[PDB]
């Protein structure tokens, strides 16, 4: 009836990849990666 | 303006301008229409 659902720009695998990158940075580099180079 | 080599001319107010604004502030007011 005219209703459409737009897909999200970030898919679930890409969001999971972002979380994986954050986890890898915080495990291997601590807080250094958040303020500059890892 | 003796600040040990630090220059703040771009953020301090300009005496030459009637609005008494900084060059950055003047740029910001110019860039908004």
């Amino acid at each position: 009836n005219g209703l459409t659902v737009l897909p999200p720009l970030l898919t679930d695998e890409m969001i999971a990849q972002y979380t994986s990158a954050l986890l890898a940075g915080t495990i291997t580099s601590g807080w250094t990666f958040g303020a500059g180079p890892a | 303006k003796d600040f040990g080599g630090f220059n703040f001319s771009q953020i301090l107010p300009d005496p030459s301008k009637p609005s008494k604004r900084s060059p950055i502030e003047d740029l910001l007011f110019n860039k908004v229409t």
């Binding site: 459409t4 737009l6 897909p7 999200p8 720009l9 898919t11 | -």
Partner: protein, 113 residues
Amino acid sequence: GTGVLTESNKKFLPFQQFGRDIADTTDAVRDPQTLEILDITPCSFGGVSVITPGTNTSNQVAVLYQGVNCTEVNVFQTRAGCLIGAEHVNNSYECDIPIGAGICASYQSIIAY
């Protein structure tokens, strides 16, 4: 009504004639002459979006039909919909113009990636 009639796998009881979904819209109907069940899918409707760079750079455009398969309208099928006028490349770049479902568009002709 208006719709697309497809073969149905439903098991209508003999009294039952037309089927309604959760939202009380008629999603299945029985033909009164030959007792077979047909699904009624709503006709394809979607938004038409124009992907373009600045007019200073170029006048080329691409069109996105949201939620519409490519066979009911440089043709590329995305989850967001059918994209006409942009070539799909296998290389990955940063997002310039967001299309959706992980797909973005850029100008280099207009490419989608």
